[PDB]
Each structure stands twice: as structure tokens, then as C-alpha cells.
Design a protein around this ligand. Structure first.
Ligand SMILES: [Ca+2]
Length: 438
């Protein structure tokens, strides 16, 4: 098995960069704040739902949109005891308020019938609704993007869109229904793994982790795009035993490649590394939001992990920043443990690449999963702001231990300072639960 070097023209999360993280993450500038349990309330208008991954309605540039005098937050919600109830709800608050009680609930985006009424064959097998993005179009529409999950068909994941038709009521917002409800993309095998490859390899029993979800909408130069979590296909850098010999996945030096590769090949994470081919992918959309072009991934994570979630990208102060959430338990880097959860981050002069790691390693946030902690935040997401050097970091917060009258809720947002290729958690920047702008 001969060593080689092949980048496929895309950026890579290398083992050398990741191996720096266990020592770097000890610094407070990279650590998600800790929120005392006494400061936290349920989203009252959720009426007892557990509210998880959320994303705001954004203008094309990523900033928060103003719809009819309201901010809009879509969120996955349901109950921890029944995953197939997991569904997208549309919350909203009138611009200018930050209190958590100001968040109103317009209910589920979709009726159970909507997937059946839609001229779409993949929507028929949907069993859960997973995360995505939403944009306030020039026509004044609410254009939603999310993940079609099919528990029936081997966990297929499909990038899906729909326009959410909404009325205003002087008092409130109300969902009238959806249209242009359709599938967009589900992998092509050669650039992005698809469920067929997953099935052909032995579905779940292979240990592989097939992802294709969390589309994030972004425009640039009158082009519409979706950046999303995925896995590499056969013609980028695909998974397999051979992938551990591509030097591009290691970085640094050929000296380092030999040292790391041999140790990896004897590590008990060897197999996990061979199957690890996570990717932040990209496709161009036509003006009707249908597939126009499958573009090469913005970055891949071969041998490092199979799962880089919640792709996020936006232009800010002249540079493009790219973020993804990732679990330490699913990584194969020595020093990175199951107690650690991350937001990684990269920067580029153009939306389409090439991307270099922020803070020299890609580390932006590390959230600790110790037990003696009562609360935990998850699914961190950077929300760009109109002016300034700070982005708002939203997340959802859960509590250690069960309470019949406490659910997953909006975490207190905080600020992340972004300057050039360096980021820093702003100390004393705690906002209200779910606050989007500062
Ligand atoms: Ca894989």
C-alpha cells in the first residue's frame, strides 16, 4: 500500500491540525460559557415541547431577516422519548424584544399531508424532519431548506425545500401552508455519498455513518448555493483502507505522515478512520431552487471524522467563514475525548475556497460534557450581524436529569469575536435565551 498525496482541489481537516487541539482547547478563549441552571426557562409558547436545533430566517448575506416586524426561528422539536415526532416549528418574536417570553409559536411548518400532496417521490418516505436554513427572498417569501429523513429507507437524507406561506394578524403570524415543496439533492455517488452506497456496504452494520443534511443557504454574485453536511464520493477522496495513506489528510511533513500513519494503523480507531470521510459540500441552485450544479466539497475530514454537522458559511468584513459542529466521540484524534464537543472553523477570501483553519487548527469552540455540570449546550451556530466584529452564537440547552416541566430550550446566546484568521469568545457577552442580534 503505497503512500501518495492527492488533495482533489479541496481543503482538508488534517490530523496535524487536529492533534494541536487537545492542548489549545484548554484556553478559555475557545470555550463555550457555562450557564447556571437557575437562569434558564422553557420556551413558554412551546407548550411543553422539547426544542432542539434552531436556525433563524436570514437575509441572503446571512444577517437576520425582518419579516413583517418579526424575527423568525425555525427549530426541530418533539420529545426525547419518540424521535419520529421530530418536526420543524416556526417561532417568532417582534423585532426589538430579547426576552424569552417574547418568542411566539406558530406551530408546525408542515401538515402530515404536505409530503403526500407534494409532487415528489422521495418526500413520501420521510419519517423525521431534520435541520436546515431559511431565507427571506427578494419576492418577500419565506424560503425554507431542511433535511428529509427516512427511517424506512435506511436513513436516507435528502436536501429539501419549501416556501412557507404566512399571514399576519396584527397580533401574530400564522402558517397558511406550503408550496414548491420538493426534493433537491440526495448525493451523486461520485462527489457525495448517497444512501445506495450506504446500503451496498451493509447499511448500519458496516460501522459507516452516511450523512447528507443541514443545508445552509448562501448567495454570492447572483448565484444561489447550499452548503451542507455530507460525505465524500468515489472521485473526491472516498473512504476505505487506502485513504489512510493519502498525505493530504495528515498535513505537516512526510516525516509526520509516516509517524502518524503507522500509529493510526495500530490504533483501535483504525477502522473508524478508514470509514471517516465527512465533508462540507456545496451545490448551486437554479432560481427555482432546483439542482443546477454539484460542486466539489469546500472541505473534507477524511480519517478525522465521518460527522461534521450544521454547515454554516457567510461573508463578514471581507472574508468568508465556514463552520461546522463535531463530536469528539466520533473523532479518531489522540487527545480528543468523548467529553468534548466542538465548533470548527475555516476562512477564505472567496466563498468557493480555498479554506484555511481559524486559530491555526480549526478550533473555534469547545463545549465540555462533564457530568458534574447540570446544563449543556448543543448545536452551536454563528449568526452574522449587521455591523461589528462579533457574531452571535445560538445553541439549545438541556439539563442533566429529568424534570416533567423542563424541556430542551433556547440557550443564552453569547458573542464570538472574529478578526482575520483568529476568533475569541467574548468574556461577559451573555445575552437572553435565543437572542439573535446584539
Ligand atoms: Ca463514511
Amino acid at each position: 500500500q503505497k503512500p501518495y498525496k492527492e488533495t482533489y482541489g479541496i481543503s482538508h481537516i488534517t490530523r496535524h491540525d487536529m492533534l494541536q487541539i487537545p492542548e489549545q482547547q484548554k484556553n478559555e478563549k475557545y470555550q463555550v460559557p457555562e450557564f447556571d441552571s437557575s437562569t434558564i426557562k422553557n420556551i413558554s409558547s412551546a407548550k411543553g415541547l422539547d426544542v432542539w436545533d434552531s436556525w433563524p430566517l436570514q437575509n441572503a448575506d446571512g444577517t437576520v431577516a425582518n419579516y413583517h416586524g418579526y424575527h423568525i426561528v425555525f427549530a426541530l422539536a418533539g420529545d426525547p422519548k419518540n424521535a419520529d415526532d421530530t418536526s420543524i416549528y416556526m417561532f417568532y418574536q417582534k423585532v426589538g424584544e430579547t426576552s424569552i417570553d417574547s418568542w411566539k409559536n406558530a406551530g408546525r411548518v408542515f401538515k402530515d399531508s404536505d409530503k403526500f400532496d407534494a409532487n415528489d417521490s422521495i418526500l413520501k418516505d420521510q419519517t423525521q424532519e431534520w435541520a436546515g436554513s431559511a431565507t427571506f427572498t427578494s419576492d418577500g417569501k419565506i424560503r425554507l431548506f431542511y433535511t428529509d429523513f427516512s427511517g424506512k429507507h435506511y436513513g436516507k437524507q435528502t436536501l429539501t425545500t419549501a416556501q412557507v406561506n404566512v399571514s399576519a394578524s396584527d397580533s401574530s403570524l400564522n402558517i397558511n401552508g406550503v408550496e414548491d415543496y420538493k426534493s433537491i439533492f440526495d448525493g451523486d455517488g461520485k462527489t457525495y455519498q448517497n444512501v445506495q452506497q450506504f446500503i451496498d456496504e451493509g447499511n448500519y452494520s458496516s460501522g459507516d455513518n452516511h450523512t447528507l443534511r443541514d443545508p445552509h443557504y448562501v448567495e454570492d454574485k447572483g448565484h444561489k448555493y447550499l452548503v451542507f453536511e455530507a460525505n465524500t464520493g468515489t472521485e473526491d477522496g472516498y473512504q476505505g483502507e487506502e485513504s489512510l495513506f493519502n498525505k493530504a489528510y495528515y498535513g505537516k511533513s512526510t516525516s509526520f505522515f509516516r509517524q502518524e500513519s503507522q500509529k493510526l494503523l495500530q490504533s483501535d480507531k483504525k477502522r473508524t478512520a478508514e470509514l471517516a470521510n465527512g465533508a462540507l459540500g456545496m451545490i448551486e441552485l437554479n432560481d427555482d431552487y432546483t439542482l443546477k450544479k454539484v460542486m466539489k466539497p469546500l472541505i473534507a475530514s477524511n480519517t478525522v471524522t465521518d460527522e461534521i454537522e450544521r454547515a454554516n458559511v457567510f461573508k463578514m468584513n471581507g472574508k468568508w467563514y465556514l463552520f461546522t459542529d463535531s463530536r469528539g466521540s466520533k473523532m479518531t484524534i489522540d487527545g480528543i475525548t468523548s467529553n468534548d464537543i466542538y465548533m470548527l472553523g475555516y476562512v477564505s477570501n472567496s466563498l468557493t475556497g480555498p479554506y484555511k483553519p481559524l486559530n491555526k487548527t480549526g478550533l473555534v469552540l469547545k463545549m465540555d460534557l462533564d457530568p458534574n455540570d447540570v446544563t449543556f449546550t448543543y448545536s452551536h451556530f454563528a449568526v452574522p450581524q449587521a455591523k461589528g466584529n462579533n457574531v452571535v452564537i445560538t445553541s439549545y440547552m438541556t439539563n442533566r436529569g429529568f424534570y416533567a416541566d423542563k424541556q430542551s430550550t433556547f440557550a443564552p446566546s453569547f458573542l464570538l469575536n472574529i478578526k482575520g484568521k483568529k476568533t475569541s469568545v467574548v468574556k461577559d457577552s451573555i445575552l437572553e435565551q435565543g437572542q439573535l442580534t446584539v
